[model samples]
Target chain A: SEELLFLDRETVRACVAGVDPVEVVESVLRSHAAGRTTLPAEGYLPWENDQGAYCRSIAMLGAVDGERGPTYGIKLINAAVSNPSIGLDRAGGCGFLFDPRTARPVVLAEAAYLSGLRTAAYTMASLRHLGPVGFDAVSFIGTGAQARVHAALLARYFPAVRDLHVFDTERSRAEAFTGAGHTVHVHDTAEAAVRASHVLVTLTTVDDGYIPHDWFRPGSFVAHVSLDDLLPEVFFKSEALFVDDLELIRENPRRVLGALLADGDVPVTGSLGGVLTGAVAPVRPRDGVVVSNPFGMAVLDVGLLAEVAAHARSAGLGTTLDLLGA
Target chain B: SEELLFLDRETVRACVAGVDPVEVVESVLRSHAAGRTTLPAEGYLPWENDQGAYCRSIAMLGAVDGERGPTYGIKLINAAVSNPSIGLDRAGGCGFLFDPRTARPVVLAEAAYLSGLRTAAYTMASLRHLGPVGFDAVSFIGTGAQARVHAALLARYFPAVRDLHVFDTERSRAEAFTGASGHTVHVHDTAEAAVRASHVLVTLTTVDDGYIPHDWFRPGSFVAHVSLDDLLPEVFFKSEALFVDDLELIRENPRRVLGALLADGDVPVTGSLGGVLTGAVAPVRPRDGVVVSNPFGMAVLDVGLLAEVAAHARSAGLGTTLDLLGA
Candidate 1:
């Protein structure tokens, strides 16, 4: 007989009530730092006469031990272009605590929320690492669902940042994020916003090159959430370069990012997972400049969903139905 | 919401009641007589990749007018080595009636039983046309499931078959058919029994060869229920040929019979389905010898099952289940 467990969206939300984003950020950072493993770049092929409508990019992440915790993540991204491509553009994270007594899979969906939370959390994590911390204001380049989540989560992490500058092609969307009691600068130009803020986070779907490298200040930290938005020359020339997984980017970088790197002919610094796990040490510079890149993984989503499922079961939540031998 | 109906195996048994084997036989005979469209021979590839496992046969039958009376009936028969060959051992007959107003498909599972009845019914249908009048004791050479059903159905059509002579490789199976009152002869030797009987029915799974020939019969009617079983050279050379659908046999004849005819180096006779349908004509006799052949078809099975499904549906007797998306 199978176990009776129920899980859904509401249960997932309840499980992430007191998530520690700092711990997630540290876990990812430390895992990469350890250098135990490398991130494989995912690939996809979409063509006619294939088994399915489209192919998908496959990526793997593994960690032995990290300063903050032990973590592993895998990502699968489908590249179907025909429709709106539902259920593909998702970013979430999760982790596990292996019990030595009985080796069985346990629920950890709540921890999975950390995957998403850590995406933003690791920015603050990297900021702390490259600290000489200046600039009271920070700006977000895009205002999508991820931008909103990032803003909400970052408020909990960076209390001192007094201003939030948002710039997007859509003026109303930029204005909608204004009511939360912070000064929201709706910039008509991305360049103006980037120049105005010392700390910048770019989250956009624009596949063609969007980020301009020359706009950064000497002490600024740029966290690129979108894969290929940043130009490679920025990392190629910059002295202080950091990443979640060096091998991941080395083996197969994100399509857009890898294309730019190949075009500019440059190598990535090191994997943030290896750096986080203490396997590879980041090469620092006397003249401080830092850049962090994040490629989301689905293992984080699985971990998060697992935790949520466990929580929902404990709370006696979700509907039940049998679907077999009909 | 869709309606749910519960139809089980017993429901199928009840559906069998509506099938008239005599009617089905007449329809098949008429279709063949009218030269209604015949299908090209279809092939089956067995799992073993053995060419011998394949079956090759043709289908022919269609309704002449609108469906006020008898509609379509089909005959299918296999012509290959009887035993080791996987080809047409399970050959049977089928028929269908269509309500032209609304096109719908129906199950004819009981067609298998209908086929068995018609095989016997067609023999009687042929005998009535061929003029071998006033038959006495009827003899069955095999006593399997088909033999039993055929014997029971034939009892309704041939009352002269009061004294039944049966022989089989298995004595117990043949003895099992002997009900308390009927005159049943459990023959120790098949050849001795074949010589004594008037109307002999040789029904066996064995190949039709030199086993039972013209000399064994004692000046009476003989029916080969296993269509290709009486293909011995002596039998073919001696008897006048009668076939349901002469064009069908011409197009796709029994391999053994055709080979024997070709071997004897003579053109075969042109027979007719009209003789069996309306009892209008008889086989052209070569000085008082007759032989009739039926090549079975799949369309018969399709139509037969269709008729059964329709009857079963009308009686409010069939299986049903809930739709997958229902709450």
Candidate 2:
């Protein structure tokens, strides 16, 4: 029997509230560890001599099934630097549902929501690897879409993150997050926010040394979202450093972390993949300060998409269209 | 200022009747002699393993205005290999249009009619160049759509030729050409028809050795619609072999002859561009028997499309919609 399932942006967004980020991340970590997932060289067509951005990229998600669940998806990435100048610059991601039983391909286009959800899921996975630790306050450097999603997802997982301190260059945005309910302290600067909070989530686009080693508290954990937003010197000073993929980070080290690596300093700890798969252990003495830098991976995207597809299937959501060859 | 033209199969058939085959041939010869056209190269797709057929293609027609007005059109040359197992393998052509004044890119959907017209025009052009002496009873080896167009076009220019003999593998096709009138005869064999007729026109799909020879015909003139259709080995046996562009023909010779170069020897007296442009002596003397091959070009296509566009505009036959940039 053939089961028809369809998922759009609305359906995906509706299901985002119930998604378990930790479970998705753990599944991806296992899949990567088992060698089911392979990161191939990505293709990018440079436009107007700009080569840094994710213009057009594709990653293959392998098929994996276990007693826990079945997951499969591919991530397609596209970006445009000049939108207003050239009109609608198309850039986004896509995921799919592959039946491990039959190996049939299913299409799911929930890029925007999936990107946010998968990011939160990866963070939750890293947090789980870090072990259960009591943290009183959580601070966000930028109150963007990612910040809101992370807050919502983290709230569902860690109820102890009651104190939410937010700061942004835009005062109104920071005020908006504060007005939305959780105990919000609008810090005057990133340094003050880092010093005050136990868990610091940096999501700023400010590349001019916004994050400094002096700002980080001795016992706090830093989760750097934007690659360029965090300074490498600050990471070097930390007791331990962790990343999503070491090879990727080494090739394209976060834009802002150039100063630390430029002076030939390596991360004290290996990638998050290593710790999650038990290949390398997280820094001992649980109280020591740690930094987890997630450059993001296509596998995380595929995992989230697979979860969304499964959820959408169980809920009887989305449309089925007859395409070519059908 | 915008013109839209529609030339369907029927319109194309009617126009074919007005073309002069010999005159069309002369125009083609003239175009070939003047370096106004180029031969097509073999196409290669990186993923595909094998090479495909050759193309004798060109674009741009010489602009002529007067009593004996210059005709306008586009031209193309295409050939497919016949195989019982694969059944008609790999066919391609070189095509071009002469009209530079038109803004719209010419769609190749109606290329069949365009090719017919240009081929007919080339026949008429050749008749004009060869003069009244070359006129005789014309015979066709195959009675297809091209044969019908050739017959109609030849009648318009060379009215002196009263008989039109046709031969085809299918009796019905041969009968169809005869049914169209203008004194038609259906022959039982190709060689029998060629021997009797002065101006022999052969357009068939034969891959075997020497289907016809130099001695098969009385020394007259032979116009092979497709270069390979002419099976005479002697057509390719000299240094001054009359050709359109010696360099182009040399680079892409196999395609122009539709792979006949593989079977028959090379031409003896190849004509050059200088000979036709300067109105030099016809390479083949008027009294002497000669054979000339034509691979169609873009200049002929441009002329044909130009004519069709003008005809369509004059009749106000089609409507034009405003584009995004236009108010």
Candidate 3:
């Protein structure tokens, strides 16, 4: 029997918080890295507007979790930046989870909360292999929605940190993030934040790649989350660079990190999944700057969302409808 | 302002019939052929199972209807061929139409009726461009769902033809098709009886591309091979000219007949049905054995149908919809 269950944002928010983000994201990444999951080259739908816009795309990333069986996830997204302006979320869409053996969609849920959670989960889970390098203080550069997710998630999950430093060009936003239910030392400049912490996270969309080598210091860990605000020198000076996906990073759809590292230009140690699976050791963690970039595929979101949907089902949440009318 | 409208199968069916398939398909095809439209490459999701496994592909054929316009359509289809065995239609899915200006999904519809209608419409509308070659008799080689659609639509449309010939390996289906409605001559033996007619057509996959020769499609007969199968290269080579949908012909994938024509040698593209519409192609004076074909289906056709449903929603009570913001 097949049922289509729809989880509203609040229901989704609660379930995401209920599940362990690290366990869910880690399992999906491992499946992806090990080729246990099945995904295709991306699906696209272009737009017909003057300013060059693209329309909705059906992103399918299906995986077979050894523990929970098989689930196929198809995510629909309209990534228009103008969505929020028109009284919609910044990124609006839905995700469908299907049974692989029976080929039926089991759940359909609103994806904004789940997508943001999984992205933050991806950064936090990398700590498995990212640790042992010794980092007492952590810095956040250019705080935004991602910053809020990290702060809330890390505050609850990883409380071993002695200090948290936050910085952003928008002083009001930086001030607001620190005041967001967590104790953090807010700094005026990005350099001020970068220099004070052993590990730095730059989460801005500026694309200027605007970080200086001196600020990164000799021994540090930098989580280059979005690849937009970091300068080429920041990557060039790194002792090792680890990415979320090696294949896609090489393909370089965004054309930033991928293009910069073309023709074996910038050496990459290995993927985070590979590192967690004990595949890539890379000179036993050098003291030099170690930068890790994540492969933000839909599977990680699908994986985390699957956990949320499972919990929702057990707890009796969300609206159920017959999509097939069968 | 952009709005979200939902149209189920029933609602989609009425509009599909009310709106002329030719008019709908033509508007979309012309916009696409002229480079005015923007569309992404098609998407696929294959599957493997027992009892004759089926593939599920997420087909998104969406387009902005103009070289200049605020309206564009985006259709999402989960074409699981196996759904029918489970008391579902062979193809069942949904469609989403968006406004390029506001970037919103203006309408969403259960796509069973919409998809079937637009595909049949493409076949029907092409009759205009494949013209001036008159023949009283029309043959149907593969009589399936698409065949029945053609029979019903064409009977009402080109009623001049008093005779209709249909053939299927399963002759019972052919007999059922003619009896079902529209106009008919009686179905009979052989692909021979079917192809001897002046205007020839073969649609769908009940059997193999049986066999079609140059002799069956005579001089002064129009052949619309929307079913890329059923007709042999022999018929194409002997024919004076062949015109296929330019966009579909671009896809050198295995499923298309255009690939075979290209591989056989420099098969010329006389003109598109879109070209015929705008008068880029003249009355196509029955150049004995020349044929015109619109792609069996167009992604832009989904756009065309999606917009129609949106406007239809203005007056009608459509289907189910969710807030998406049900947070």
Candidate 4:
């Protein structure tokens, strides 16, 4: 019988609790940089929701090299910008992990949790490799789910970062945002938050970049998690720039970096994985304010999901259904 | 809470039992021909199984025009050729039907049953629009699950098909192929069954078209090539007319007989089955040779049937609903 294990949000949470996201992400990045991973062209389906907002279903397939063996998985995410208004997350999806031996699906997991958590882990991995040395203050520009997820993982993994300077377009949302596990300062202006922090994380959903190059503190590290938070000058005038995957950034036509990269305005110094593996040099204080932009690769999600599936198997968690019925 | 309904194989069978596949397929083909449908390029993932044999997972997405509204669905099918060696069917998959209003998935169903049924319905529709005027004696080349499905639908919808001339390499398997109710099954020992039969011929074999010759098809025969490679290139060229469900789907895969012919510019597509059904193109009633209809299959048919099944399953309360957003 082809039994398929289904891990819902709760079950996924239980499975994920046993794994260290940073370790998983680092391994994925290493494997990716070493050419041990296969990343295929992503699938995108566009539709208009009831509210006339543009919605999309994004699918990503990847095979990552790991200790247990070759791990193949697909991450499918559905996004509705107005889902928050309906009391739902803006994104939801499912993850499918295939058994290497049989090429059959072994686990189906709720992917929204993995999606957000993987983005958080990417930031954590970014900071570990390309961050400013010994930073105590972190600033967030958006107080949405992305900001909250970053906060949760930052507090858990990077305990040294104690000060949280936050700013949102909606001040009420900024005031309500919590999870820093230490001091949280809500700023009325974006500049105040940007000027005060050593590590700036932009997580906004804006189409245009409003944050300029001068807002950064000298020698500060910026995590451009949200692709469109920084102006073209941020990329042009930054001392050094890094990205998760250069091809992914180039494929995204809407993002500022992709257009700039296409027009030959900016040059990426290296990949974060390259920097982590010492294939490229790390940013130095002499390099001034450094920017690390990750267009969010789903390959990293596959890495974390492999660990989650491992934990689920060992713990005997999740529901099993005979999906194939033999 | 985001509640998602999951219909198992038994539940989907029950849901589909209430719908007429012929009517559903005709509606789908009409909608498709009238430009009231959206069909995306299908997805294919190729991998080698443990037996070192090739395996693939296919995904099809479509939205069909319907009376209730726009019906959108996706059919995902996984095929492993060696699965039968392990007591499993060669194909299994799941279907997802979406609510057009919210763009949310309303139902997830076991898809292998629907996949097989939709192919059968396509053959039924082909025979209705492009087949011979009347076909009483029918011949099936391979006695597999596809043959069984075609047998069941033919027996149910077209009771006039009273004689089932079945052939298989393993005569024991063909002998064991039962369920031809209200009809007689003649287990032929060779591929000559395809030549000695009547006006309707169906090929469900897995092997290449090495056994059946071009002259094997009788005059005025309506051959249904359900399995991809049952007819040789000569058969396609020599046929009175050739029809496919979708020309693009046929041309996409070059391994199929029609695709290879089209690639080498050997034959022109007479017309799509949809074009013929919608009166955009005239059907060819061949007085000589055969009119071969090879339907590459359509997502619109799957979506149409899924829309009907979703309605019945909703009223009947016949599936497990999962709270997708429940914490």
Candidate 5:
């Protein structure tokens, strides 16, 4: 008797809160580095909604070899640019974990929340290994859900950080993010936020890179989470540039970093996993910027889903449906 | 506030049985011919299972402008070659209908059964417009689920057919299908049954194009169904060809007909939708062989069929509502 477990948003949030995301993410990255993962090229469908706002859906498929067994999953996420205007999240998604034997989905859960958690955890993992010795201030370029999530993780883990500088095109969105335990500063311009902090994180939907190389004072670490916020010059002249996966960066059709790599203009310093395993030394330049662009990975998402599935099994959270008939 | 409706196999079977599949498929094809549909290229993931048998999954996305409004859907189907060894169907799938406004799924249902139904209905639709005047003997090359589906539809609509000829490499599968009513079915030892029947259906999964020879069927006969590899290039060159969608057939990398069409240098091919609905052109009944209707299948057909099933399920108050936006 096979049954599919459906976990809603709240159930997934509870299960996500139960795990140490940083540790789990570390294990996932370690497995990826060891060649125990298969990450397929993502499937994308771009469509314009009725209101003429551009929207799209993405299907990312991945499989990972784990301690217990191999896990396979797919994450389907959709983004409606007009959603924010209606007071809804701009993006929504769902994840499916397949039974290795049958390839039938055994667990399906709301994924936007888990996606954000893993993304924030990935940034934290990057910062822990790549950041300068000690930083007093962290600046956020766009105060969206991702910005808020990363802020919460940084606030919880990096107690030494005392100030959170934030800026958004819309002033109201910037003012909405009050730092959890640190002093919050909403700057008038992106340049002000860029200059205020030792660690700068950009999380915006802008396609044209706006942040210039000179905007960042020397020696600051730029976590290019959004992929398109920084101008081409920022990457062209960086002292050290790293990526989560080199081929994925090259495979992406829309990233300026990817475009730069295509033209053989930017040479990547090392892999994020290589730094985690100490195979490549982490470079924290004191006289220039050290940038790491994470294009996101599906293997890590599948790995974390296995953990969430374990928690759901132990706690018995979710509804069981006979997804396929007898 | 949004809840996705989940319909299981039995629920889907009930819903599928409630609608006129042939009519819905006709409408979908009409919409496609009129350029009122958007069909993105299919997404495929091929992986070998534990048994080393070739298994794969397919994601087909499509949107159709219908009488009510625009409808969007995706069909995710997987096939495990080894499943048949365990008495399970080789293929299983699920269909999802999305809300156009948000592009979020509103209904999800078991799809293999519905897939078979629409396929069989498509064949029937082809036979109605492409078949010769009248035929008494019908031959099935493979007695799998598709053959069974086509046989059921033909038995329901064509009362004039008195004889059914069936042939399968495994004779037991041929014996398992009992004729519906007012007809006698015979299990033939060889494919000679195909030579005698006026209509021949091939539903095997062979990829090498086993059925050969320029003269396989009698004059003014019909051949239609899913298995694209049943007829060799020689046979296709000697016969008239009709396709459900010409572009989809060429886009498919492995079909023998496509290879033949490509080798002959951009030869002409006609689509069944034009002949079936417009009544502007009909297949010419040649002096020999058969009029082969090769349907590469369209995602809009699945979308249309699932949309009909969703309406029936809603009216019957069947299926479970999963609230993805939880507390």
Candidate 6:
């Protein structure tokens, strides 16, 4: 009945900068565990940048509801590794929410911005709960865009960080982090950074295993962004492990990880939602380590994006497009 | 380095209403045969319209070169059976053509209309080549949108389609073909009357089975739109021959009427339709019994149409433009 509200990147950024990440993230996660959403597997079209950098045009068609009616639909989380060098500002995406029935998208959301914010919120939700009560030392393994966002949230989440270390595979990149005007210490070596932290995060873009499972201290809280960064043994050997969604994590395990575990009872403690809702308690590693890795699920995106959509609508921002020309 | 041309449905309908179907169809098919295009298997997401109607949101990403750089890509082809009734549309799609190694989507085209045009053109192109020369009779097994469009194109392609037979298990729909202001259609008493007369045959629906055996025809030409294996088993084994886009790909194809024949232990595939268009394969029997051509370029077809239409639409100012990060 109404025109399509086309929200662009700026509009999405407005919502991103304003929302309470932990609040919406926790709410959406809880809704997921309660079986209040419909999420299909992520579909993708493999793409490439002119610079020979491979990318994917991934589309996620999922809906989350508030008990009933007014569902949501999001399409195309377009990403390319060569985006920066090729002059793309960010991974491109768009979305829409259905009214009474997301018969189709009613509001077109600039999805790339929401995708990033939701992921950060996923991290914040996990870190606020699963992270150590107070860390004498904390470190980030990769200094990408996510590193900055994680740092922003971690600052308020953790009262004070005595040792805040950052590292990149490239020495100049990490060493230049301080040069970029950050107060945190930066390291050239990943091992030194990993060893220096009571709590650690691996946010590298590496799509496969290279880390040692034996590197963690007893009762350390580890949250990793890259799904493929750790070896399967790392999780199977952990004292406890949690995920944002259990079925999601269990589905996307790398073949290499699947082969190693080959039915080795990977001790999945509970989902963040279940843990928060008291549906299941996490098996905390009393004498060892706890690892939390959540698959970036589209089911999570719907709730958060829906949250952002409401804010954008109330504020009355965005261009109205008659996409169907009706 | 211009801008992303945001084409809406109105612009697409404009192009769809005007264009040379054969010229574009032939060019894309030729490019396909020359191996100048890349079409991955269509990736699909299962969807159900809240009305309990099942649907699929399909996606495709591939490149087709005009002998050079600046390829094309298409985003989500969101389709739902519930669309039409709910005041939406058939299938909503968007196309993006990149510049100089696909820097990004230079033109964002509304594609549902093109999907219809290209498919109809595919049937026309195939009919021009494989349809029985100078058809005395033609029959449409299903009278849906594609059926209507294909009939329109078929009337233009084959002049001798004297007795055009129309059939649907549902009588009123086929009978209503007259009120819709189409060509003279002989609504059949049974599937028998249509099959016996159709030197050219088209099956447009996705019915599973329980179809009457169609074995009498010699020099028959057939095409089935829905890949649900609509034709009877005997047709594949009979004097009738088969033509598909790719023999190997067709054999394992789930929707392929001929491929379903292979699973039945039928031997021999005629040849690739692409190979035929490229003149690589010899058209074996000059007077053929039947030619079933499932012509698909998937990403190739849409990009081919987009490549042709965008160049024209942009020069004439036919669509809305979005400075998506300034193109």
State the displacement of the C-alpha of residue A5, model 1, in Å, after optimal TM-score superposition: 4.0
By lDDT, rank the candidates, best first. Answer: 4, 5, 3, 6, 2, 1
- What digit string (tens of lDDT, one per residue) describes model 6 on residues A164-245? 7888886676765531223678776776777777677787768668766677777777777766667777777877778776
DockQ of each: 0.01, 0.03, 0.34, 0.37, 0.47, 0.25
Tens digit of per-residue lDDT, candidate 2, span B88-158: 22222222221222212222212444555565565555445442365657767766656766676666666
Clashes of 2: 66
lDDT of 2 by residue, A1-326 (tens): 12224455667776665567577777777666666564544422222212333222233333444226545444434344443244432334344454332233344354646777777777766665663376767888889777888887777777777788888998898888842235878888777777887677777766666576777666668787766665656676767788776555666634655335555867658777677677887772244467887777876776667767667667776765321111
Q: What is the per-residue lDDT of model 6 for residues B28-94, given as tens digits with 9 covering 90 to 100?
A: 7677788877666655555455577766555666566544343656645665665546666545655
Residue B110 alpha-carbon offset, candidate 1, angstroms: 37
- Residue ranges of candidate 1 with Cα displaced over 4 Å: A4-6, A28-118, A131-135, A179-181, A251-257, A260-267, A274-288, A302-326, B1-327
- B1-327, model 5: which lDDT tens digit per residue? 658899887887777667778888888877877778777777666666677777666777777886647788877776777776767677776777876667777887877777878888887777666676677777877777777667777776666778788878878888886867777888888876554655555554544555645566776667774677666665655666655554554545554655456666664455555445856455554345567777777778899888888989999999988899787
**Per-residue accuracy of model 3 over B1-327 as CA lDDT, tens digit each:** 223455655666665665566676777667866766656666666665454556564646466555335455555555455554566544555666655654555566666557666766666666655655354556776676567666666765676666778778767767767623446556869877777655556445533343666776656666676666666666656666666666453545545555666655676667777777667775453465746453645567777766866666565655565566552
| Candidate 1 DockQ, CA atoms | 0.01
CAPRI-style grade of the A/B interface in model 6: acceptable
> lDDT of candidate 1?
0.47
Best by TM-score: 4
**DockQ-based class of model 1:** incorrect
Q: Cα lDDT for residue A23, model 1? A: 58
Query: How well does candidate 5 reproduce the true complex, by DockQ?
Result: 0.47
**Pairing residues by index, what is the TM-score of model 6?**
0.80
Model 4, position B288: C-alpha lDDT score: 78
Which 10 consecutive positions of candidate 3 chain A have the poorest summed lDDT? Answer: A48-57
Least well predicted 10-residue stretch by lDDT in candidate 2 chain B: B41-50
Instruction: Give a tens-digit lDDT track for model 3, residues A15-118.
Output: 87777878877787777777777666665665534545434544454544534665566766666655545565445666777655345556767776677777
Per-residue lDDT over A1-326 for candidate 5, one digit per residue giving the tens place of the 0 to 100 score: 44778888888878877877787788878778878777765656667778888776677777777655777777777777888787778777778787655666678888888888888888888888887777878999888778878877887668888899999998998988886678889999999999997799888888887888888777778989889988888887888898888888898859988888777757578987888778888888588888989998877777888899899999988888885556
Given candidate 6, what's the lDDT at residue B322? 65
